[PDB]
Amino acid sequence: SIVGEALEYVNIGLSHFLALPLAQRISLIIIIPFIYNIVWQLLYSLRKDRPPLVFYWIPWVGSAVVYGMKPYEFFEECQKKYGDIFSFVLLGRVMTVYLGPKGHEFVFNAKLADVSAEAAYAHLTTPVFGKGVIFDCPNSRLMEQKKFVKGALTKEAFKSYVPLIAEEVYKYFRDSKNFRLNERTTGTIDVMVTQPEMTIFTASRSLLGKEMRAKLDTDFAYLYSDLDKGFTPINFVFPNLPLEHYRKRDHAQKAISGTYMSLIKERRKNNDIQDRDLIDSLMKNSTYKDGVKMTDQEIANLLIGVLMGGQHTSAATSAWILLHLAERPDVQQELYEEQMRVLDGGKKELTYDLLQEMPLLNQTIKETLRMHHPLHSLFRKVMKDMHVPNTSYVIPAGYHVLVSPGYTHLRDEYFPNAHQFNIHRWNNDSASSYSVGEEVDYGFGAISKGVSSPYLPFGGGRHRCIGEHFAYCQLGVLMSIFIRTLKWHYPEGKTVPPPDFTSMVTLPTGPAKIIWEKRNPEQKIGGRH
Ligand code: HEM
Ligand SMILES: OC(Cn1cncn1)(Cn1cncn1)c1ccc(F)cc1F
């Protein structure tokens, strides 16, 4: 009974492996992990304390390509094959998707000890925004940061923001090359050019104030563009690569936060701290409950993240509203009549209160946010093994969970004829959102305890959006003026473009052009320029 010879031949075999030709070795260096990956998956399917895992050929890469380009189609296919809970490999990570309202609850309402947002996002956000805020801090700090920000987002603030936002829109109609309404009565625009510009101008003016708005008229504006490039999904895997893209980003964050700190210190020196904007508010109101004060650097960094986030969600959304209305002159017509009745033929000046009496306008935003959730996927890193209720499934620590309310937004089960733009599905239901029951406070105010609504444009739970009322205010003023001022339509043969899912926000694939026309050719916008 000699197996000793077999053991000798193991060693010999190893020895002959090392002396294979470099061509053969390389081949095996490709072959063996390829093979091994496939046997591992088939073995994984045998487990039943794990959700089904989408099969994939290329190791590490996983389903990144199909998920990257068409996430909702990927989700529908996996849903038919596996049901609502399923996993897939994504550039080194395992993602567990839980679709539908039950998925909303499972992730948005997950215990603080179970999952972590900042563990998923810090590598992306922190380089762009700066240190010490949002995801570069414990959740408890984020909770209070949101409370600080919310303090400049009150109804009284909105009343003062509306005339400011209105001024910026009219100034843009007057002075932008894309319009020049005093010189031209019709023209073609790329909505992906005009809306990011209109969004930053209106949000800067209202949230940051006149000084910071004034800066955007100069070469300074280029830094925001640079900083914008740091906010892409590439940084989700490659956050720091010694290339120019990453230096301009880093330089921008320093440069922009430098500018904000400069204003903060100037105001404090001159005792010029009032109730004008978000800067005044954070200067007066940014002490944590343990007594630690946010630094001027942290305040500036928080300003960047808040403005940047709201920039991309809002610009994408106003772009979609215009693009959907471009093929619906019936809806423009209906929106226009509401403007005439509420504002008395346009003789009343637009106020925040009058905005609230424009349900069809507000429903149009609501419906656009249904068909185009700006964030198609939201992530959490799983910090300890989670048991999926009413299943035998366990999501181990190290996995990521992925929730997608935008997907449910497009399901016929919850929204009949979901792929049809219909603002009237929200008749007598024009609120941006609301809790249909019990509430809870995570540190930034009472919000809905349940997150099982099939409509969740602003998420839910501790990470829930706090910019929703600002977004409706901004989008409301913007669309109210667009409607009263212009009609618009598609170039012949053009229709609503498909989403570009490959960016951080699900903006339309551009260029996406519409043709505008003045409702009143002779109308003039006053002021100097
Ligand atoms: C159409 C407009 C917007 C939509 C649809 C939207 C959507 C969302 C969603 C879904 C989340 C939750 C993310 C998650 O659960 O992982 C969120 C969080 C947040 N958003 Fe918004 N947002 C919008 C505009 C804004 C604006 C205008 C601001 C600021 C002025 C803003 C600031 C924030 C903040 C501070 C959070 C908290 C992030 C966290 O706690 O993890 N958003 N938003
Ligand atoms: O939630 C975001 C970050 N994010 C998550 N997936 C993709 N981007 C986006 N966002 C949501 N509303 C507005 N922006 C965010 C949250 C807070 C924030 F300050 C910035 C920021 F980008």
The chain-level structural class is alpha+beta
Write the CATH homologous superfamily: Cytochrome P450
Rounded Rg: 26 Å
Bound molecules: protoporphyrin IX containing FE, ligand TPF
GO molecular function, one term: methyltransferase activity
Subcellular location: Membrane
Transmembrane segments: 26-46, 53-69
Binding site for heme: 465
Key features of this structure:
529 residues, alpha+beta, Cytochrome p450, 5-stranded mixed beta sheet, 3-stranded antiparallel beta sheet, binds protoporphyrin IX containing FE, binds the ligand OC(Cn1cncn1)(Cn1cncn1)c1ccc(F)cc1F, oxidoreductase/oxidoreductase inhibitor, CYP51, oxidoreductase-oxidoreductase inhibitor complex, resistance mutation, monomeric
Task: Walk me through this protein's architecture.
The protein is built from 19 helices and 12 strands. It has 529 residues and is an alpha+beta fold. The chain has a single domain, classed as Cytochrome p450 (Orthogonal Bundle), CATH 1.10.630. The strands form 4 sheets. It has a 5-stranded mixed β-sheet, sandwiched between helices. Strands 4-12-11 form a 3-stranded antiparallel β-sheet. Strand 1 (85-90) and strand 2 (93-98) form a beta hairpin. Helix 8 (155-175) runs parallel beside helix 19 (468-485), helix 11 (221-228) crosses helix 12 (244-269) and helix 12 (244-269) crosses helix 14 (296-325). The protein is globular, with a radius of gyration of 26 Å. 39% of the residues are buried. It binds protoporphyrin IX containing FE (HEM) and ligand TPF.
